[PDB]
Amino acid sequence: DEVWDALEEVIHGKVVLLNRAPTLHRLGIQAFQPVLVEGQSIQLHPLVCEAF
Amino acid sequence: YYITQVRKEKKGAGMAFATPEEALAAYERGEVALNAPIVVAGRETSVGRLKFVFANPDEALLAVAHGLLDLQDVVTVRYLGRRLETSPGRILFARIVGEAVGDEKVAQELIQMDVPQEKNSLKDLVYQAFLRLGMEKTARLLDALKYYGFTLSTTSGITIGIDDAVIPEEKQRYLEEADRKLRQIEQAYEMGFLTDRERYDQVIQLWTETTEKVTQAVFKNFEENYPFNPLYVMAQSGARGNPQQIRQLCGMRGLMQKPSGETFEVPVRSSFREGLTVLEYFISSHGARKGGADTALRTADSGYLTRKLVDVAHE
Amino acid sequence: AEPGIDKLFGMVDSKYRLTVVVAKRAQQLLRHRFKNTVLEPEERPKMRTLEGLYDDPNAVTWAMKELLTGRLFFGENLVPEDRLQKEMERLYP
Amino acid sequence: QKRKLQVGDKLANRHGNKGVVAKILPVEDMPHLPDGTPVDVILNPLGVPSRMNLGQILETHLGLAGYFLGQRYISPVFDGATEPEIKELLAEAFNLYFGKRQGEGFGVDKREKEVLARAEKLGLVSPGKSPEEQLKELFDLGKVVLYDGRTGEPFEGPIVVGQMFIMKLYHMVEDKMHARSTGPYSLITQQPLGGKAQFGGQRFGEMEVWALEAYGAAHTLQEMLTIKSDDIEGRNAAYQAII
Amino acid sequence: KAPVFTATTQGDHYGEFVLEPLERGFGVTLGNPLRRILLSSIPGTAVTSVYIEDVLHEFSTIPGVKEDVVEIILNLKELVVRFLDPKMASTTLILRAEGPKEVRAGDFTPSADVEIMNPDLHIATLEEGGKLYMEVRVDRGVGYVPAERHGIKDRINAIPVDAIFSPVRRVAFQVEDTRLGQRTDLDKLTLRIWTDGSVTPLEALNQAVAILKEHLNYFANPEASLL
Amino acid sequence: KAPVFTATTQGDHYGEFVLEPLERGFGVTLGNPLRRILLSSIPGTAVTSVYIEDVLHEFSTIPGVKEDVVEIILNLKELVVRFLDPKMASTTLILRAEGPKEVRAGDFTPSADVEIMNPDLHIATLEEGGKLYMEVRVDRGVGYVPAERHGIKDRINAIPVDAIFSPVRRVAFQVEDTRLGQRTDLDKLTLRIWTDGSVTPLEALNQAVAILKEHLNYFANPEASLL
Amino acid sequence: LSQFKDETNPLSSLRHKRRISALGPGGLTRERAGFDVRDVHRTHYGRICPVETPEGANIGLITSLAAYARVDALGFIRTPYRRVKNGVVTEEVVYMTASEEDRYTIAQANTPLEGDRIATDRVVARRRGEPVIVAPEEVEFMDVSPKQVFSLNTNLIPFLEHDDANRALMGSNMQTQAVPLIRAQAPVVMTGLE
Amino acid sequence: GTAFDQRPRVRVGQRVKKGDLLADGPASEEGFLALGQNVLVAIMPFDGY
């Protein structure tokens, strides 16, 4: 937990970017908040999932 | 959609009553349906708009959610200082929207309180919001429709069985008619009237319309008989599907197209739920697997064009 | 969503001008470790944690809340590029 | 390696319905049945009317009866069980299933009554028939009464269920997931290596460059074109500064 | 294993509660039961029927009054009172106002021990020389009891009305996945309860938990009938 | 009114409980919440640790055996063993088999504070001259923890196994129309419990109500605030 | 024509072996294949699978062999059939070549067979792959089974006549992308070819 | 990377006829191609998951 939390401390604020190929619409690259979750998978908002 | 869907039964038959009492007793006796458009005194109103008088929304939910009413029924409400005739879910919509935006006064002011909310209405609402309200406001509204909409979809639990698309009984009939008309066109081929090509046209058009005499019946069946059918609703509200798709999943599939490109001369009849004979499937697979490369290849020419346009208008 | 965006966008004439402002200003905030800014101890963008609730180290957000108040001044050719970096490095270590 | 079905791993059936695993779920809260039997998947009734594959529907339809009869079925391609056949197997499976309820000292659940009623209003079950027969027409339709493990209340309309054949495909998140910060660089040009095994980051296509240009992110684009790709002193002054 | 249950309310109407953190699945076990009982139980005022002079039918209009009969019925349903002594489970509120006037819930004539917690409310408007008199009936109970249910007529022409029993309006809880340290499987269950004012949300919920553990302790005395 | 509570059991496996009469819809409000926790928090065993003389891993094949180690674990996860003492935190089961015999849960080495509830559980089939030594440590725990989350470090080859504690197999409740009370539309709750050997159904419902009432009184004094 | 074996599962190699590539050194390439070398020819039938093929840009380029199809010395593909004389199904099993097919008039397996005889006066058949109504007299041959009309994997799909080719494609190929299972279990509904 | 296993199906002794299965395959169940498994499928929307 020494890290699993501190990493959250450097995470808050700044947000990363997710890109789905092919990149047609510029909306195929959007900026989301890095919320650490269990598992190897990646979660995404069901609505904008259309733009990708 | 499902929640805002205004339900109307047909059992009540829409009779005539002098006082609300006969209609009432009728409802209890099972002589009339709840949302059935009946007539009392000199006016007409459903048994619901009478048996349910809500002086506010919270009363509506408190009664319905408690189990004394169905989520979608025609009732009388006092929502936002006015006497209307709508459904509990109908009120719920404008309520969620307003609770997301924060003042329901502008919310209900820009929304449709008359008809169920399908793709279009939802879209329009989002636009009007982002334009009149502001960005974050709309982010909120969207997420609201997300959470509540999703949960509602789970509530209904709408599913798909083999019997969730029933083919109109007019299939066998209206098509067996064309089975005679073909034989007629043939008699014309052997009577000299029709040649080999105009016969091809008479048959191809006979089936072109024969596809309509059925496809029409499909939708007329989902509308006249089973308005709450999952397939129909799904394709209607814009949840999933298109008319031709529902056509091939209920009504007749239609004539295919030979890989040489000239359309076939033989009718397929049977739908996906009916099941296709070996022949039908193989005959279809021609133009079917044709379309695969028809799209997949062209996806390249898309890039071919894109890159160039970028290399011209970039500056 | 970033609260204030409707107001932020509604300030500058362009779109990106806002980005230039937020960026440069945030830079000034991380250069001096927040001892420059215009915010009172209740305005400070706090970051809740299981440990203690400090002020959010993210400069971007700090700049957000900074401009949202309007206490900041921005514009082209405002002051000489010389003293602007000369007195900014003086007042604060 | 003994790999257990994870969250996000590929899964599909014989009817060409793909999908990944989105978040498994505690047996506790599950849409179970009056016999306390929770389902195992909960698939979405959307890609059926679009992709037009009614096979999984009939497969599951037969599976629904085959559950209570335990008899394995063989339906040859383009020659097989039809609606009447399966309908018969459902009438049979029900006639012994509901009878197991009568025998075990029970009757028609109130919640079931609720569903049968609101479904009778839309004409899903022929009016004038007792709940036994209504739930009989429903059970044979492929649908039944499901209780939500979370709430405890029955779902509005009947939900089809049954036994279906599914497959865990090749693609596994465990092997397809990856990321890096500072890795190896190509000898020729100092560009980061690609792929997975090479221990390298992804590529920023011309498409991406254009997208960023359309957003207007000047520096974010330059980051992709300098400090984070082939730049020499830049990446070093990055790992220097950030650290 | 160490719940932090807290509450954020406002006035006697709105109130919120947060039990965080918790075990996976429990938030749901708490949510429905509390909810189902909070709107199906919890005793309260709930006006039942009303009588009116010159007005026999629940339809026929009343001259001198701007609003019709139904509008008044509605406003009467929105009104809320309370019984001071546990003895009185049923009382009768009265009122009479003539001439041009703005009739309100405050204008209502008093009762033995009954306090109208909703003094400012529109009941009806009276035109010039408007003759209005009414004796409303108020009992106590729980849940919802439409006009169909109770057949109350304490007079010749009296008019039964929907009984709004449960002082609570809507609850609609929400459980959200919360994280503390490790194991993101946790419950942040939050509950928003609305009250008409008979009792603040705190008291309502606290009453519900009682109606819960009480029912729970009902499993004491087994009876072995082995098959 | 007082609820008639009856408890009908069968063995340590089956049991049914009925509480009638009750309030309208309440049968769900009570019956489901109990079922929830009932299928989760009930403590159980289903072993943890396993070791055999000649094994290097979970895939190894021992001479004289029909199945591999993983198929033996496939039956080790289905192995129920009750503890005659509530104070034990662990144990070690011992097993030995020679000659042409079918090994089973009943073939183990009996000891104090242990009883197998399924001596008929097929483990491995020992063929001609097939010699097999085996031992397991069946610890008691709560919930579901796969072997990948718990270590052993017993010795050279110590192979962990999944843990299915939850002695409760399945639970199903039904809400019907009860004839035992004044008014109508009331409920007769009937909760049916199916568990294996470890704990009796009655006991199950007992501790279930225990944990339910515990997390229920967690609603004690909060911390106020208002905007 | 020589690549890494497909061992992803047992059926995998069995499919990878029965695959027919139009590519390779002396084949064609992704350039010169528009439609022709992709599209499904009328004669395909009980020889080449009308559906199974990679969903990518290679659709129609590489297909598989039919479960009953065979390849003689000359290289042509001959599909099994059954001779018939005036509504009498003969035990004669003929492997007709591609050209041989266009000559005779073949019926279907779903034809109305009453005790080794024809039932209806209008039976399903064709010529050169051209479905037409036919009489009980003019029937020269018949199909052994609809199974030959498809491939292996495709024949493992129950109620396939109730679905669409698009999905059947993946429905087949993914079965090759399939993986074994420790507790693996055969479907309670099959086609009986397993 | 997919394992190749053969599970013996026969007793310590019994007489069988030529063609009878003595051991399964990696994907085989009693001489039946077994890919995946048969579960209880629920066709219904679930919170958009």
PDB file of C-alpha atoms in Angstrom, chain B residues 218-219 222 231-232 235 240-251 271, chain D residues 49 52:
ATOM      1  CA  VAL B 218     -45.291  -7.668 -40.434  1.00  0.00           C
ATOM      2  CA  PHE B 219     -45.327  -4.113 -39.128  1.00  0.00           C
ATOM      3  CA  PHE B 222     -46.548  -5.577 -34.523  1.00  0.00           C
ATOM      4  CA  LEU B 231     -38.153  -6.979 -31.622  1.00  0.00           C
ATOM      5  CA  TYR B 232     -40.598  -4.299 -32.729  1.00  0.00           C
ATOM      6  CA  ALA B 235     -36.117  -1.513 -33.805  1.00  0.00           C
ATOM      7  CA  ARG B 240     -31.436  -2.230 -32.202  1.00  0.00           C
ATOM      8  CA  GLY B 241     -32.439  -3.126 -35.763  1.00  0.00           C
ATOM      9  CA  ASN B 242     -33.849  -1.788 -39.037  1.00  0.00           C
ATOM     10  CA  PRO B 243     -37.032  -2.462 -41.085  1.00  0.00           C
ATOM     11  CA  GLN B 244     -35.509  -4.822 -43.687  1.00  0.00           C
ATOM     12  CA  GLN B 245     -33.755  -6.714 -40.885  1.00  0.00           C
ATOM     13  CA  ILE B 246     -36.993  -7.255 -38.987  1.00  0.00           C
ATOM     14  CA  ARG B 247     -38.436  -8.184 -42.383  1.00  0.00           C
ATOM     15  CA  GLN B 248     -36.008 -11.056 -42.765  1.00  0.00           C
ATOM     16  CA  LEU B 249     -36.421 -12.053 -39.111  1.00  0.00           C
ATOM     17  CA  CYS B 250     -40.204 -12.279 -39.341  1.00  0.00           C
ATOM     18  CA  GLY B 251     -41.643 -11.882 -42.836  1.00  0.00           C
ATOM     19  CA  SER B 271     -37.666 -16.345 -42.651  1.00  0.00           C
TER      20      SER B 271
ATOM     21  CA  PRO D  49     -32.096  -8.657 -33.934  1.00  0.00           C
ATOM     22  CA  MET D  52     -29.745 -11.780 -37.177  1.00  0.00           C
TER      23      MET D  52
END
